[PDB]
């Protein structure tokens, strides 16, 4: 298994510095190029940097020329991206990726990626969310009943919601967070079920907010 795991992001104030790590397994990072690709919220892909660790050859983009530096420790098989003088336009999800090459030299592409890591550049403060149950109702409309959870008043992104620790998946709809008038984020995550099923199986939503170290498992119930 070729695997790449990012780490080291989160909230950082403007003008700050942050070092992201990309731990690689299943291959030696000296074998290939290692790339950093960033994506602003609701925008397109943008190449940040690339490194050949074995020979130490660096390659950057003009947007991050003087501030961003890409390092690599083969002892740890880990790439690093240190970012200085961070502006608000640096707010993005940062992926690390491996470049594979056509054996001939035709050109190749990024075959394996990481999960990405959100880097928010903002003077605002981290705040944990509050989780409230959106309880099922008397209504039955098509014989359908919805329940859910409301994660409210949190900074920054992201939070992750699952239902019964990922066991419950069908009928789930988790909505994108929306910036409130408060300057804080808040979202909902609902699940549809048959009305007769309400008395049988239990429903728990797991809310996770790592910038605040908030882990809540809230049980939703009728009435």
């Amino acid at each position: 298994e070729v695997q790449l795991v990012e780490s080291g992001g989160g909230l950082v104030q403007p003008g700050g510095s942050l070092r992201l790590s990309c731990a690689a397994s299943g291959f030696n990072i000296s074998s290939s190029y290692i790339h950093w690709v960033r994506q602003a919220p609701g925008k397109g892909l943008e190449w940040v940097a690339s490194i050949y660790s074995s020979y130490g050859y660096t390659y950057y983009a003009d947007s991050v020329k003087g501030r961003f530096t890409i390092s690599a420790d083969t002892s740890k098989n880990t790439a690093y991206l240190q970012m200085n003088s961070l502006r608000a336009e640096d707010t993005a999800v940062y992926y690390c990726a491996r470049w594979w090459a056509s054996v001939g030299g035709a050109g190749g592409g990024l075959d394996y990626w990481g999960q990405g890591t959100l880097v928010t550049v903002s003077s605002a403060s981290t705040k944990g969310p509050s989780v409230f149950p959106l309880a099922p109702s008397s209504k039955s409309t098509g014989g359908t009943a919805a329940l859910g959870c409301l994660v409210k008043d949190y900074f920054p992104e992201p939070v992750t919601v699952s239902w019964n620790s990922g066991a419950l998946t069908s009928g789930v709809h988790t909505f994108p967070a929306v910036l409130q008038s408060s300057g804080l984020y808040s979202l909902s995550s609902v699940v549809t079920v048959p009305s007769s099923s309400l008395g049988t199986q239990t429903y728990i939503c797991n809310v996770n907010h790592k910038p605040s170290n908030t882990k809540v498992d809230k049980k939703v119930e009728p009435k």
Partner: protein
């Protein structure tokens, strides 16, 4: 070297033939790659060196070069193919990406299931109130949700959010939140959301009485 991607977005039925084109500001060799990105996930390499399929990629994806233009084609669009597709020019020491083409599916009209959630007591004790209206598996995405407190149409105190297209039935879902002070929430009683959508002959109203 830059990549101009057309179209900006497109809408197509299951089974159609979809084509996405990237033009290069300067001449480039056949070092174009095609990636697919589903929402909230890392991009997946579909095609490399303009015309070659990466392994595991279905045969419905194909790549072609016409001089300075590069084309990715889906022969028969599937519901799971909803995604933003990107083109990349580069060799591993510098790559530039296209702006991306968002591809969504066209399907038959589906009417939303509509549900209403009153604020929790736990939230009222916090001094705020959030009433949530949910629309479930409706297509098309265009819909209007209007909040009525005591049969009075409100404005400016509610925010909505929409999921991305489902990958099996190609539908959307919406969530509208009316946010009021515990005081103004307790000063009224009847709370309703009225949904107007194409699949609904007459608009649907879901409501509750506080307590």
């Amino acid at each position: 070297i830059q990549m101009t991607q057309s179209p900006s977005s497109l809408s197509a039925s299951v089974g159609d033939r979809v084509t996405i084109t990237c033009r290069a500001s300067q001449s480039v060799s056949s070092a174009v790659a095609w990636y697919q990105q589903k929402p909230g996930k890392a991009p997946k390499l579909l095609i490399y060196s303009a015309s070659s399929l990466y392994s595991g990629v279905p045969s419905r994806f194909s790549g072609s070069r016409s001089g300075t233009d590069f084309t990715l084609t889906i022969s028969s669009l599937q519901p799971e193919d909803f995604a933003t597709y990107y083109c990349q020019q580069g060799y591993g020491w510098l790559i530039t990406f296209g702006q991306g083409t968002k591809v969504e599916i066209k399907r038959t009209v589906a009417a939303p299931s509509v549900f209403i959630f009153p604020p929790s007591d736990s939230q009222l004790k916090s001094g705020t109130a959030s009433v949530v209206c949910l629309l479930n598996n409706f297509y098309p995405r265009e819909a209007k949700v209007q909040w009525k407190v005591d049969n009075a149409l409100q404005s400016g105190n509610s925010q909505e959010s929409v999921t991305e297209q489902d990958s099996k039935d190609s539908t959307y879902s919406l969530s509208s939140t009316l946010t009021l002070s515990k005081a103004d929430y307790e000063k009224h009683k009847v709370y309703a959301c009225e949904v107007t959508h194409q699949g609904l002959s007459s608009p649907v109203t879901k409501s509750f009485n506080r307590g």
